[PDB]
Design a protein around this ligand. Structure first.
Ligand SMILES: Nc1ncnc2c1ncn2[C@@H]1O[C@H](COP(=O)(O)OP(=O)(O)O)[C@@H](O)[C@H]1O
Ligand SMILES: Nc1ncnc2c1ncn2[C@@H]1O[C@H](COP(=O)(O)OP(=O)(O)O)[C@@H](O)[C@H]1O
Ligand SMILES: c1ccc2c(c1)cc1ccc3cccc4ccc2c1c34
Ligand code: MOO
Ligand code: MOO
Ligand SMILES: [Mg+2]
Ligand SMILES: [Mg+2]
Lengths: 156, 304, 637, 624
């Protein structure tokens, strides 16, 4: 009779953490993150204001998640597309937390996992399309469909 | 000057059946033109894919904010009040037809309007205008209003909804509150979160959200009330009205423990009004006891 | 001008380097001396082949080990070719000078001789344990001399007047005070067995037991040098038993050779039963050993074979592999990848061949089915070939298992996918609610009732061009008719309000409530989203000791509740909801049904006591045991 | 007569052995050359200490690397002491001749000099990748000569007249056609980072991008400084450079060992556990071994046990004997002594960190699994590790508490520590096993991880007091004589019901007895003193690689304990007395057993039976 031991398969994951500025500027990342999102450290920190990395279709989704994080202190699991150095779009599943130095937020730590195209497309298909408090059928997507965009994305 | 001479050179050929009445309107940036339309295929099959006046469904139109489709705006430009006309359009203008009639009729996989997706061709357009008004006379609808003017128009919707509620109508009051809430929430997007202006915008939405919750409660729709009251409480946790409404909704859906806790929080936060909460608790207890007695009946000799 | 010089060497520090920095293990001195003795015996045998008169001073070719505890000396005697005085001075007195290498170059081409030793420094390892070394030699055409040295920069050669050795050499080591352990029987046996087990001459050991009991150490021959077609299964079994110390024969054997720039021979065995410590991490993987010219070099160490094939016992022998100065590792270790590729290919071929004999493959699968699935989980290059070795129980099979190929052959014309269910046990999966409609329609379901099975199906996306579909996941597609489609649409329309109400009641417990396409007799069931862990996988993952709890949110799937339109309870629920949606009985029944489905689908409750209390309340119920400001507060603002 | 001879050497074969059998990695040639340059710089620096006029041909001591892809040559220029014609011949033309060793042995005692190189064969590693080698050198008291060779048995020395070098040496390698990967920036950077990171002089790489000169070793080896003269800012900078981590370190331990075995160590604790901490596919490189600031090998589980794999640090020595390749330690057994010291000091650091409540909170949140794994695996330090454990308790609320705090609050009559292992905190807190124990005011430890289940198998006692599970049979609680008489009365009263129930559930259980731990629940399932618990059985059934073909002989037996004070049990006794062969009692007993089994952590062999029972009850309730 074999006594209880700790035999384990030891699966391998691909989750990695990153550090961001309050505008979601990537400053610091894991090695796995670099191998997923090919980017030199010098380039990454000196690229944009964070939202320049997001696919256009997910921009409002990510803005809403960002507001949710600022309010509750952390945005739940979200799925969207990142712009790699190769001008590619890869699906990620991310959760972002807000850290406060002294009563005020200091930086954001993001834990994300890379996704395949099929899974990302399925998640996008299931994404909610009706806001809780929209303005009913005003044909806003037809008449104007041109909003200034939320201020949360504004620089600084 | 001569807009028909411009239209004919533009590539659109039209004919007038019955001229309109009055004077040509400015049709500046932002003008409403309520009119009917009846689109039928020019020569490919000759049938009618879409219709507006056939069943009496005018098409409310505002002239030129963006209106991705340019054809309709130009079509309505060259008419006056009470004018009816018919004409065709080139494939280059309506090449994006599937993006227009996809939901404008359903919301109120089409086999008629989708024929152009495979064989674009000329399409006839039978317009019939009734009224054409510049902004300022008719009541602008909330979506197309400007932030500056809506910041001052919001209280009017609030008071109208309140009057509708007192007068004895809730669905219309609920819609008024919903529209005011949408206007207020959209405004918050223009400011940074947590800023004093953001909080100021957030203070005047709580009364409207509470009124909307009350209106929903009278309609016997308790889960929405639960969601909205929970949303209020997660951020304020000090509103006696929010706690009272949440407890009432919980008691309605047989959430005994949560209703009791909410009423207890109401008591320990604003002890002034005891008897109302006591009556609510006693009514909930009587309902629970009656249901327990009834279940005792259901569950009897279930084994023997 | 341009001066020219020849490279020199400083002898004292060279000897110090050889004695102190070449070999990490001191026991390898015996290996080197035995290698030298075997080389000498090879030389004398080759010479005598053409000139039989050379074997007149002795006809037996053998090696002896003679410990002398009293004198603290170890003697290795061989009857090889011996050395002359000039040979002594040159070969033993010159560092990096090899007589074996020169002998090989002086030899003809196409000679059936393979000798160890080409560096010319191995002999000096004797000073790892010996303070003084004496070598007495006797060549055929020369006298008997004695060679002595302490590795102090000089050596003496003199004629020896002692016991006349007929022919060969005799190395006497005067051991150091702190190296006396090598005069012990068990230590010598261990070293000889580890390093010089396949020497081509009988290594005899002489001990005092009085009389001199002889303990022969070379009993087993290196059978892998013979042609595979001239070996019977009995000799294979005897060699395997000697190699593994097993009381039962082998199950299968694969004997092959490789030729070219990389040439080697291999002999791979499959044990009849798995060892109890097969998967233990702290288990040195000496299952396969590497030999060069029949001398042990190194163990497998997961480099000669993948981790999931660690149950294979065998030997890999080569003739031309470049070794480093110590003879315990290869130079340019990238060669090990090619040998691994060849071995894996041949092991898969052996597995495929064994599959034709049904009973033998039954035993093999019972023993090592885990390893195949671990390989499928780990290895992607051989994933397709490994998947053809899997055997499973099915709903349409009896006590016997079947392969996926037999399943695909027996598939229906309208069927497009292989259906499988993973669960705790065969009884649980067979009687589950997920397989009701599938089994009723006549389709076949593969039963997967091992924790390892969950790891395997994560990588086996398809087989034979047909995808594998789990019956416990949402979006199960089955072939149907137009009547079935219309009936399903009718049911969807009829039950929409009930589904909305149940979703309202179970808001955060589930993600969606829908009409089932796989239920017959059950009222409902819970299925997971297409992406993420199933119920069984979630159960297995949460029970892992070395699991990171901070990342379960990224892997868990969402739950969908599916209700059966044809069940009486669902019909009564629809009627009650139509009559009064806020009915307390409806809400209680919905919660109870959800809990029951959650427990019956492989999930676990966050608080089982709530379910227990509900049941106890039901049991007790069955047994019979038990001002003007009011308007102002909720009118406006 | 006795003849005497000296030992000789065959030069050509010796060179062949050096070039073909000493080093298995061709990239170590750059390590050898950089070590030689560092030795030369050390030699010149030492000489100028007592005679500053030596540094007249140049004051800066540096190393330069200059690839030449056009010429296919690699140049290493160092500003060391240089060598004369005689030094050239003797040192660079004699195998196993070391001028560095002679330099050391000529010095006095107590010299602040520690130089790599004592074998006199390293330089010939250049012929691993080079067809021809040219060495330009210039000593202070000599001329500038050129040394050339192809390692073919001879070398040429000539007076060089090309562009002069003020002082030092210049090694020019003519690379082979198949070894041009070392003319690339990435490869050279990778090699120098791996092997010569902590050389004591700047190393500059020159590339054509104007030429771009980039220093390659920007981090000093701070482990040589006094531990009490280092601030936390520079500790953190060194940790970030060493681990490539965007965050600082949680704690550091800097110590030295003196004697026959001397080394210095610098060990760090990260702030967050890595996501691949227990991943099988990764080299054990968390702790690296250095000899005289030159990398030797990785931890490879020999310098530190497996459960301390999260520790990042450096171990440096001076007098560890190496093998010829300088890639391992002759008599490597030394690494077992070093491991003992490292484990001792790591436990010391863990104990010191505990005094800081919040830092230890972070540390425990990150690496509590490692401590329990160490308790399970390690027996020498099991007692010390157990004092580091923290648990949620029925009396600690949100915060976690230690076992010493539990003993401090221990009641006078209490003699044991009570614990429960379960799936989660919610499940155990509301369990039926802890009802009476919590009612009496006793304290129960909550253990909600599988690793906790593995840990309690080795932690039999603590501070002299044994740990007792509340889910096992024979739970002994302190009591009063009234309790004994009441329990005897209850046993006598329910003797018949227990017999009837054991008859109804034949072979499903072994015993039915009156519970001494229930308050509100009507019954519960407990396991026998011998065998696995419910949680243990759950964890063992989920091991993919474990062979569970014999688990039937390891599972514990289950006893059903009923609560005499519950209304359901009293009604059951009355019904059984009225009629034993009733079907209602049988069905109710079976339903109770299933509910208790599901509530005790077990799983049914067929949940569909329970589901069908519930569905039948629902149908009867609805009238169908
Ligand atoms: N027992 C022996 N009989 C004959 N010749 C020997 C014996 N032992 C050593 N020699 C000779 O002395 C030399 C010692 O060098 P060694 O380190 O053994 O080199 P090799 O790698 O060729 O074995 C060998 O080349 C071999 O020719
Ligand atoms: N760059 C250099 N400057 C001065 N002397 C050198 C240099 N490189 C090598 N030497 C001399 O050549 C000798 C041989 O070096 P090597 O064979 O690498 O091993 P070791 O450094 O142990 O001597 C050294 O002892 C040293 O005196
Ligand atoms: C690289 C670059 C940008 C972003 C990123 C990684 C990850 C994000 C994860 C969550 C998230 C939530 C709301 C707004 C975001 C905006 C930008 C990014 C992210 C956001
Ligand atoms: O006998 Mo050697 O010197 O190891 O080839
Ligand atoms: O520089 Mo050496 O010859 O490796 O000690
Ligand atoms: Mg030899
Ligand atoms: Mg050197």
């Amino acid at each position: 009779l074999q006594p209880p031991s700790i035999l384990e398969i030891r699966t391998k994951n691909f989750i990695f953490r990153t550090k961001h500025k309050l505008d979601f500027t990537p400053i610091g990342c894991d090695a796995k993150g670099r191998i997923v999102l090919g980017y030199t450290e010098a380039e990454l920190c000196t690229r944009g204001s964070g939202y320049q990395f997001i696919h256009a279709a997910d921009m409002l989704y990510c803005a809403e998640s960002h507001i949710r994080m600022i309010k509750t202190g952390e945005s739940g699991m979200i799925v969207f597309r990142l712009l790699t150095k190769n001008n590619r779009w890869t699906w990620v599943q991310s959760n972002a937390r807000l850290l406060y130095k002294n009563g005020r937020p200091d930086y954001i730590i993001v834990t994300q996992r890379p996704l395949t195209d099929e899974e990302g497309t399925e998640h996008l298909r299931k994404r909610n399309t009706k806001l809780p408090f929209m303005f009913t059928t005003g044909e806003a997507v037809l008449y104007e469909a041109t909003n200034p965009f939320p201020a949360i994305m504004d620089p600084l | 000057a001569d807009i028909i001479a411009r239209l004919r050179e533009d590539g659109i050929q039209k004919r007038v059946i019955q001229e309109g009445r009055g004077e040509l309107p400015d049709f500046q940036d932002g003008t409403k033109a309520t009119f009917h339309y009846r689109t039928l295929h020019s020569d490919d099959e000759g049938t009618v894919l879409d219709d507006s006046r056939a069943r009496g469904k005018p098409m409310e139109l505002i002239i030129g904010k963006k209106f991705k489709l340019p054809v309709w705006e130009t079509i309505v430009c060259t008419m006056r009040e009470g004018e009816i006309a018919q004409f065709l359009c080139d494939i280059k203008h309506v090449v994006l037809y599937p993006l227009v009639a996809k939901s404008l009729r359903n919301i109120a996989g089409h086999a008629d309007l989708d024929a152009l997706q495979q064989n674009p061709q000329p399409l006839i357009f039978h317009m019939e205008m009734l009224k054409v008004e510049s902004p300022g006379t008719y009541q602008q609808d909330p979506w197309a209003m400007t932030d500056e003017e809506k910041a001052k128009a919001v209280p009017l919707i609030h008071q109208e909804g309140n009057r509708l509620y007192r007068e004895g109508h809730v669905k219309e009051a609920a819609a008024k509150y919903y529209d005011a809430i949408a206007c207020l929430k959209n405004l918050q997007m223009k400011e940074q979160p947590g800023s004093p202006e953001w909080i100021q915008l957030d203070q005047q939405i709580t009364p409207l959200l509470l009124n909307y919750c009350q209106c929903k409660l009278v309609v016997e729709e308790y889960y929405e009330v639960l969601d909205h009251c929970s949303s209020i409480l997660n951020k304020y946790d000090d509103n006696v009205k929010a706690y009272f409404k949440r407890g009432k909704a919980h008691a309605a859906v047989w959430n005994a423990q949560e209703a009791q806790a909410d009423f207890a929080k109401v008591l320990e936060l604003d002890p002034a009004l005891a008897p109302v909460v006591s009556r609510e608790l006693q009514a909930l207890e009587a309902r629970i006891r009656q249901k327990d007695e009834e279940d005792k009946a259901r569950f009897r000799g279930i084994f023997s | 001008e341009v001066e020219t010089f020849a490279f020199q060497a400083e002898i004292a520090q060279l000897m110090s380097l050889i004695i102190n920095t070449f070999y990490s293990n001191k026991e390898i001195f015996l290996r080197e001396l035995i290698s030298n003795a075997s080389d000498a015996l090879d030389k004398i045998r080759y010479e005598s082949l053409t000139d039989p008169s050379k074997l007149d001073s002795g006809k037996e070719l053998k090696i002896d080990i003679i410990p002398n505890p009293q004198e603290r000396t170890l003697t290795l005697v061989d009857t090889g070719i011996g050395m002359t005085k000039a040979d002594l001075i040159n070969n033993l007195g010159t560092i990096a000078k090899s007589g074996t290498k020169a002998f090989m170059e002086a030899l003809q081409a196409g000679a059936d001789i393979s000798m160890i030793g080409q560096f010319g420094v191995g002999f000096y390892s004797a000073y790892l344990v010996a303070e003084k070394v004496v070598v007495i030699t006797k060549h055929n055409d020369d006298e008997q001399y004695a060679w002595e040295s302490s590795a102090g920069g000089s050596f003496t050669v003199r004629a020896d007047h002692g016991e006349p050795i007929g022919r060969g050499t005799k190395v006497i080591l005067h051991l150091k005070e702190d190296q006396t352990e090598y005069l012990e029987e068990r230590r010598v046996k261990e070293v000889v067995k580890k390093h010089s087990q396949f020497i081509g001459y009988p290594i005899t050991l002489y001990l005092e037991k009085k009389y001199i009991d002889q303990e022969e150490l070379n009993k087993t021959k290196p059978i892998w040098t013979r042609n595979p077609d001239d070996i019977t299964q009995e000799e294979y079994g005897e060699f395997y038993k000697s190699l593994t110390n097993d009381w039962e024969d082998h199950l299968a054997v694969k004997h092959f050779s490789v030729e070219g720039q990389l040439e080697f021979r291999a002999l791979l065995f499959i044990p009849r039963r798995a060892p109890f410590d097969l998967f233990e991490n702290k288990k040195k993987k000496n299952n396969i050993k590497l030999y060069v010219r029949r001398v042990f070099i190194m163990d497998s160490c997961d480099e000669l074979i993948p981790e999931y094939l660690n149950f294979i016992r065998g030997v890999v022998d080569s003739e031309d592999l470049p070794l480093n100065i110590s003879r315990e590792m290869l130079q340019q270790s990238k060669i090990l990848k090619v040998i691994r590729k060849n071995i894996v290919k041949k092991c898969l071929e052996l597995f495929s061949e064994l599959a034709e004999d049904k009973e033998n493959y039954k035993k093999f699968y019972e023993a090592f089915s885990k390893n195949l699935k671990l390989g499928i989980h780990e290895d992607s290059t051989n994933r397709r070939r490994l998947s053809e070795l899997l055997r499973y129980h099915t709903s349409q099979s009896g006590d016997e298992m079947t392969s996926l190929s037999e399943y695909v052959s027996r598939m229906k014309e309208t069927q497009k996918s292989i259906y499988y269910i993973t669960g705790e046990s065969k009884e649980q999966v067979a009687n589950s609610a997920f397989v009701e409609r599938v089994r009723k329609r006549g389709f076949e379901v593969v039963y997967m009732t091992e924790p390892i099975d969950e790891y395997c199906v994560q990588q086996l996306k398809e087989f034979d061009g047909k995808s594998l579909v789990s019956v416990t996941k949402e979006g199960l597609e089955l072939p149907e008719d137009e009547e079935e489609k219309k009936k399903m649409e009718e049911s969807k329309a009829k039950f929409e309000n009930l589904c909305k109400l149940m979703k309202e009641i179970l808001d955060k417990k589930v993600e969606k409530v829908t009409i089932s396409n796989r239920l017959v007799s059950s009222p409902c069931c819970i299925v997971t989203s297409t992406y993420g862990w199933t119920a069984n996988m979630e159960r297995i993952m949460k029970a892992q000791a070395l699991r990171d709890n901070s990342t379960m949110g990224y892997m868990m799937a969402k739950k969908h509740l599916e209700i059966n339109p044809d069940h009486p309870i669902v019909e009564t629920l629809r009627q009650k909801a139509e009559a009064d949606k806020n009915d307390k009985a409806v809400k209680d029944l919905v919660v109870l049904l959800f809990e029951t489905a959650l427990l019956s689908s492989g999930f676990s409750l966050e608080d089982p006591q709530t379910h227990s209390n509900r049941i106890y309340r039901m049991i007790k119920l069955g047994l019979g045991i038990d001002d003007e400001d009011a308007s102002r507060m909720e009118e406006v603002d």
